[PDB]
Amino acid sequence: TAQNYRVFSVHYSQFHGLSYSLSELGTSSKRYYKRECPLPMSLPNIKDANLDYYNFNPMGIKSLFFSSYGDPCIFGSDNTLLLLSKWRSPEESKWLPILDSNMEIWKMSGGKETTDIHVWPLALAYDTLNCILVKGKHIWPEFPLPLPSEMEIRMPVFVKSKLLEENKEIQIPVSMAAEEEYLRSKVLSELLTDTLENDGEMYGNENEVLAALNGAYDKALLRLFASACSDQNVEKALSLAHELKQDRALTAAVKISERAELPSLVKKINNIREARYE
Amino acid sequence: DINIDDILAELDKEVSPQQDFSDLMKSWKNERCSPELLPYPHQLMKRLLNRISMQSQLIENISMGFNESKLPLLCMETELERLKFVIRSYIRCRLSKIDKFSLYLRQLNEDENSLISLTDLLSKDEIKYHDTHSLIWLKLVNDSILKYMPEELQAINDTEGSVNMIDEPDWNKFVFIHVNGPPDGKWNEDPLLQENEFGKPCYTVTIPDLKEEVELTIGSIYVMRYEVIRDLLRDDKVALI
Amino acid sequence: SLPAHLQQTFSPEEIQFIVENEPIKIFPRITTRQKIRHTRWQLITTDDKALNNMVAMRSTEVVLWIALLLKQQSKCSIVAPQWLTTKELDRKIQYEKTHPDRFSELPWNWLVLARILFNKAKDDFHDPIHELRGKIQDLREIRQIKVLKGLKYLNESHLQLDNLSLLEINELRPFITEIMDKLREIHTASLT
């Protein structure tokens, strides 16, 4: 799959194993990012509804594409969307699963173990996978193609046991919702910062949405800080507000410390602020 | 656990044409179902005619300016005719209700003790229409009927007849209303609002011909007499569905 | 000046106009977005920021007359709301059959929007149109049974409903208003 001058490939053989190669050939500046580095994906476990597809596509690749900002994405047989983060720096590159789409399919169905709906991926815009939700016994869509639905990316930190335990529509509690919002905001802030610093902005919207994303980052960190302070956990609260990015939201942590009556936490956060003035 | 909504809400904070158009259909839907002729929103309609004039010169200037992307021009065009339809229907409905209550309006002008006047109630064009319609109807019934009747019975603003000469609007006409609460989102400043059972607040109003108090919970639709709901509609708390 | 059939009520095409003047989620099939290297939309009765930022194969929110106008072009495809699914309509049918005295929590524009999207969007539904229109007709019929049951309580004082649709308000407006007006006239003549 190629997008503009970037080329992304997947190799497999019995004597080499699964791997990927990413390159940017261009009209000039011929640089190859990674050549046949191994690919973290699970091949399918090799009834006729799946065997009609796996005789046709043995690798389990539903789709292979780039994001709207140029980050590579792959959709394996385990129905998870893997994005390659920090691919420009080969010593910091990592593959981030940003959708375990079976889990969100189970989540929108009210906890029912649902089989008759599947995700057929097409594209990834920023925080949104465009994909046809195919209903029926077949994974693939038919010729009267419906409108591709939108699936917001969620970091897979959802355990089914706790969601079944609290719900005696699956409603996520505010603690792990803040946890996934914090993680998703952090990885999306990293991706937007890398694409804006390296490739620049292709529109005018990228700086303001990065600022709002850092805002949603700090709001989720304060909601984790509150659950830390509710359990009289001073050290976890200090570790949570130590990762707080902006100086605007530290005063909110001071007010939560005032509501939780932890004056040593107030003193250490003010020492953090003292380090932050210079 | 720690409730964090106020500090996060105060951290989040760290005239417009669409509202004018929503107010225009609020006036239109309140006008169409009401028996009483509603007060004229003079500033809103003056702003709407100024806006439609600026859009008319804008679309004509872009037509002089005529890649060919004609879909914004089509958006301008159906924009203009749908706004013209709304303004036309509102003025036509209130002109029909002017024609229904000509004698009531001329008595209300003739009574200096009453505080309601056509300068506060009607436009200049509507005042002109009502006045010259009253004179042309007057002249038609003098040279048609009232010339041949004696001095007691040519009066058209009569009151002491066996049946009342002058038309009167149905003040207790039943109308569908949907409560919106206050126009603003801040609920506590309304003195008439009061909290009830099951969480939902209501407005309490009294029907005097039965002498009963009735509760109008926020979020539900009713049919009520117009005299009961007149003071809430003039303060713009309900919408006439 | 006003016609007699438009005197004290709205015509259904005016209801169509009113529900054409709402926002709706939609998928553009054209790109009007300015890149880093075309007359603007510039509307005065709706926010044109979502229309200036129109991106192909994304979710945007535009007004419904623009939605129908662009669906006629097929430059942009209208997305059905959440309540226009088979599961949500079955949930509404179950709520109607569960509580006989109370109407279901349907939107005010549930008949007019359904008719508009049936006659204008024949290829824009994830669920099939067939059972969707069947459930729409079932909800319409059970709401008709509930308003027929509730019309036995025509009171001189007042009468309340919870979640009746605007099109059903124009269904039942002249009959209810005239009958209650004459009942009130009878009782006010009955007063000393």
Write the DSSP assignment of A103-154 as a string of letters: HHHHHHTTT----SEEEEEEEEETTEEEEEEEESS-SS--SS--PPEEEE--
Q: Which residues of C touch B212 (CB under 8 A)?
A: 157
Mutate to test the interface with C, among B64, B96, B174 (most CBs of C within 10 A): B174
List gaps in chain A by the residue before each (C–N > 2.5 Å). 46, 168
Strand order in the sheet with A63-66: A63-66, A72-75, A80-85, A94-100
Question: For residue A238, what are its two tokens?
Answer: 């200090």
The alpha carbon dihedral of B35, B37, B43, B48 has a sign of: positive
| Among chain A residues, CA nearest to C60 | A150
Binding-face residues of C in 91-150 toward B, CB within 8 A? none
Q: Which of C66, C75, C162 sits opposite B220 (nearest CB)?
A: C162
3-state secondary structure of A35: strand
How far is C-alpha A14 from the chain's CA centre? 31
Task: Determine the Cα–Cα distance for residues A269 and A273; give it in Å rounded to an integer.
Answer: 6
Task: Determine the Cα–Cα distance for residues C154 and A240; give it in Å rounded to an integer.
Answer: 62
Question: For residue B83, what are its two tokens?
Answer: 């706004």
Up-side HSE of residue C104: CA atoms within 13 Å toward CB? 24
Q: Which residues of B touch C162 (CB under 8 A)?
A: 220-221
The number of residues making up chain A comes to 278
Q: Which of C66, C161, C184 sits opposite B75 (nearest CB)?
A: C66
Burial of A200 (0-12, 13-18, 19+ CB in 10 A): exposed
Distances (CA, A) of B70 to B73, C32, C67: 5, 13, 16
- Residue C177 and residue B175 in contact, taking contact as beta carbons nearer than 8 Å: yes
Question: For residue A84, what are its two tokens?
Answer: 């390659």
Q: Which helix (H) or strand (E) holds B207?
A: strand B202-207
Mutate to test the interface with C, among A147, A152, A209 (most CBs of C within 10 A): A147
Rg (Cα) of chain C, in Å, rounded?
21
The number of beta carbons lying within 10 Å of the beta carbon of residue B179 is: 19
B223 and C176 within 8 Å at the Cβ level: the answer is yes
Residues whose CB falls within 8 Å of the CB of residue C75, separated by 6 or more in sequence, listed in order: B71, C28, C29, C30
Residue B16 has φ and ψ, to the nearest 5°, of -70, 145
Q: Which residues of C touch B51 (CB under 8 A)?
A: 44
Q: Looking at the DSSP assignment, which residues form a beta bridge with residue B241?
A: none
The number of beta carbons lying within 10 Å of the beta carbon of residue B50 is: 10
Task: Determine the Cα–Cα distance for residues B33 and B175; give it in Å rounded to an integer.
Answer: 7
Neighbours of chain C (3+ CB pairs under 8 A): A, B
Q: Which of B21, B78, B92 sits opposite C69 (nearest CB)?
A: B78
- Alpha helices by DSSP H, chain A: 48-54, 101-108, 160-166, 174-198, 206-230, 234-242, 250-260, 263-276
Q: Residue holding tokens 């919702």?
A: A177
Return the amino acid letter for A213. L
Task: Determine the Cα–Cα distance for residues B155 and B103; give it in Å rounded to an integer.
Answer: 11
Cβ density class B68-79: b for 16+ within 10 Å, e for less? eeebbeebbeeb
Residues whose CB falls within 8 Å of the CB of residue B136, separated by 6 or more in sequence, listed in order: none
Domain that holds residue A217: 158-278
| Among chain B residues, CA nearest to C22 | B22
Burial of A96 (0-12, 13-18, 19+ CB in 10 A): buried
Rg (Cα) of chain B, in Å, rounded?
24
List gaps in chain C by the residue before each (C–N > 2.5 Å). 37
Task: Determine the Cα–Cα distance for residues A29 and C167; give it in Å rounded to an integer.
Answer: 65
- Residue A22 and residue A8 in contact, taking contact as beta carbons nearer than 8 Å: yes
DSSP state of A204: S
How far is C-alpha B93 from the chain's CA centre? 10
- Residue C121 and residue C162 in contact, taking contact as beta carbons nearer than 8 Å: no
The number of beta carbons lying within 10 Å of the beta carbon of residue B211 is: 7
* Elucidated via: cryo-EM
Task: Determine the Cα–Cα distance for residues A43 and A61; give it in Å rounded to an integer.
Answer: 9
Residues whose CB falls within 8 Å of the CB of residue C77, separated by 6 or more in sequence, listed in order: A147, C26, C27, C29, C71, C121, C123, C124
Q: Which helix (H) or strand (E) holds B212?
A: strand B212-217
Cβ density class B183-199: b for 16+ within 10 Å, e for less? eeeeeeebeebeeeeee
- Residue A210 and residue A104 in contact, taking contact as beta carbons nearer than 8 Å: no
The number of beta carbons lying within 10 Å of the beta carbon of residue C9 is: 16
The number of residues making up chain C comes to 192
HEC profile of chain C = CCCHHHCCCCCHHHHHHHHHCCEEEEEECCCCCCCCCCCCCCCCCCCCHHHHCCCCCCCEEEEHHHHHHHHHHCCEEECCCCCCCHHHHHHHHHHHHHCCCCCCCCCCCCCHHHHHHHHHCCCCCCCCHHHHHHHHHHHHHHHHHHHHHHHHHCCCCCEEECCCCHHHHHHHHHHHHHHHHHHHHHHHHHCC
Q: Give the closest residue to B9 by CA, choosing from A254, A252, A210, A261.
A: A252
The number of beta carbons lying within 10 Å of the beta carbon of residue B130 is: 20
How far is C-alpha B64 from the chain's CA centre? 38
Task: Determine the Cα–Cα distance for residues A140 and B209; give it in Å rounded to an integer.
Answer: 69
The alpha carbon dihedral of C181, C185, C187, C192 has a sign of: positive
Q: Which residues of A touch B1 (CB under 8 A)?
A: 226-227, 230
Task: Determine the Cα–Cα distance for residues A134 and A116; give it in Å rounded to an integer.
Answer: 8
The number of beta carbons lying within 10 Å of the beta carbon of residue B228 is: 20
Cβ density class A113-149: b for 16+ within 10 Å, e for less? eeeeebbbbebbbbbebbbbbbeeeebebeeeebbbb
The alpha carbon dihedral of B5, B8, B14, B17 has a sign of: negative
Q: Give the closest residue to B212 by CA, choosing from C156, C181, C182.
A: C156
| Among chain B residues, CA nearest to A220 | B8
Task: Determine the Cα–Cα distance for residues C45 and C50; give it in Å rounded to an integer.
Answer: 13
Question: For residue A212, what are its two tokens?
Answer: 């709002």
Return the amino acid letter for A261. E
Smallest CA–CA distance, residue A4 to chain B, in Å, is 25
The number of beta carbons lying within 10 Å of the beta carbon of residue C2 is: 17
Pairing mode, strands B174-179 and B221-225: antiparallel
Return the amino acid letter for A234. V
C187 and B62 within 8 Å at the Cβ level: the answer is no
Q: Residue holding tokens 């007709």?
A: C137
- Residue B24 and residue B48 in contact, taking contact as beta carbons nearer than 8 Å: yes
Residues whose CB falls within 8 Å of the CB of residue B204, separated by 6 or more in sequence, listed in order: B192, B194, B213, B214, B215, B216
DSSP state of A261: T
The number of beta carbons lying within 10 Å of the beta carbon of residue A189 is: 17
Task: Determine the Cα–Cα distance for residues B52 and C105; give it in Å rounded to an integer.
Answer: 39
Q: Give the closest residue to C113 by CA, choosing from C17, C7, C1.
A: C17
Up-side HSE of residue C186: CA atoms within 13 Å toward CB? 9
- Residue C48 and residue B79 in contact, taking contact as beta carbons nearer than 8 Å: no
Strand order in the sheet with A128-135: A117-125, A128-135, A149-152
Residue A75 has φ and ψ, to the nearest 5°, of -120, 100
User: B132-138 long-range CB contacts below 8 Å, 24 or more apart?
Assistant: B133/B98, B133/B99, B133/B102, B134/B102, B134/B106, B137/B102
- Residue A41 and residue A100 in contact, taking contact as beta carbons nearer than 8 Å: no
Q: Which helix (H) or strand (E) holds B54?
A: helix B42-65
Q: Looking at the DSSP assignment, which residues form a beta bridge with residue B59?
A: none
C57 and A130 within 8 Å at the Cβ level: the answer is yes
- Residue B171 and residue B227 in contact, taking contact as beta carbons nearer than 8 Å: yes
Q: Which residues of C touch A130 (CB under 8 A)?
A: 57-58
3-state secondary structure of B221: strand
Q: Which residues of C touch B95 (CB under 8 A)?
A: 1-2
Q: Which of B2, B11, B14 sits opposite A259 (nearest CB)?
A: B2
3-state secondary structure of A99: strand
Q: Give the closest residue to B40 by CA, choosing from B107, B130, B111, B113.
A: B130
The number of residues making up chain B comes to 241
Q: Give the closest residue to A238 by CA, choosing from A260, A208, A215, A214.
A: A260
Q: Which of A222, A230, A255 sits opposite B1 (nearest CB)?
A: A230
Question: For residue B60, what are its two tokens?
Answer: 């004509």
Distances (CA, A) of A141 to A200, A272, C125: 37, 55, 14
The number of beta carbons lying within 10 Å of the beta carbon of residue B120 is: 10
Q: Which of C10, C159, C163 sits opposite B223 (nearest CB)?
A: C159
Cβ density class C86-121: b for 16+ within 10 Å, e for less? eeebeebeeebeeeeeebbebbbbbbbbbbbbeeeb
Neighbours of chain B (3+ CB pairs under 8 A): A, C
- Residue A70 and residue A59 in contact, taking contact as beta carbons nearer than 8 Å: no
* Dihedral of the alpha carbons of A10, A12, A16, A22, in degrees to the nearest 10: 0
Q: Does C124 touch chain A (CB under 8 A)?
A: yes
Domains along the sequence of chain B with CATH: 15-167 (1.20.58.1030), 168-240 (no CATH)
- Residue A99 and residue A151 in contact, taking contact as beta carbons nearer than 8 Å: yes
Residues whose CB falls within 8 Å of the CB of residue B113, separated by 6 or more in sequence, listed in order: none
| Among chain A residues, CA nearest to C53 | A205
B2 and A230 within 8 Å at the Cβ level: the answer is yes
- Residue C109 and residue C165 in contact, taking contact as beta carbons nearer than 8 Å: yes
Task: Determine the Cα–Cα distance for residues A165 and B233; give it in Å rounded to an integer.
Answer: 50
A147 and C79 within 8 Å at the Cβ level: the answer is yes
Smallest CA–CA distance, residue C39 to chain B, in Å, is 7
Rg (Cα) of chain A, in Å, rounded?
22
The number of beta carbons lying within 10 Å of the beta carbon of residue A223 is: 22
Binding-face residues of A in 107-126 toward C, CB within 8 A? 123, 125
Smallest CA–CA distance, residue B9 to chain A, in Å, is 10
- Residue A52 and residue A39 in contact, taking contact as beta carbons nearer than 8 Å: no
Residues whose CB falls within 8 Å of the CB of residue A38, separated by 6 or more in sequence, listed in order: A17, A18, A19, A20
Query: Residues A92, A93, A96, CA angle at the centre, nearest 5°?
Result: 125
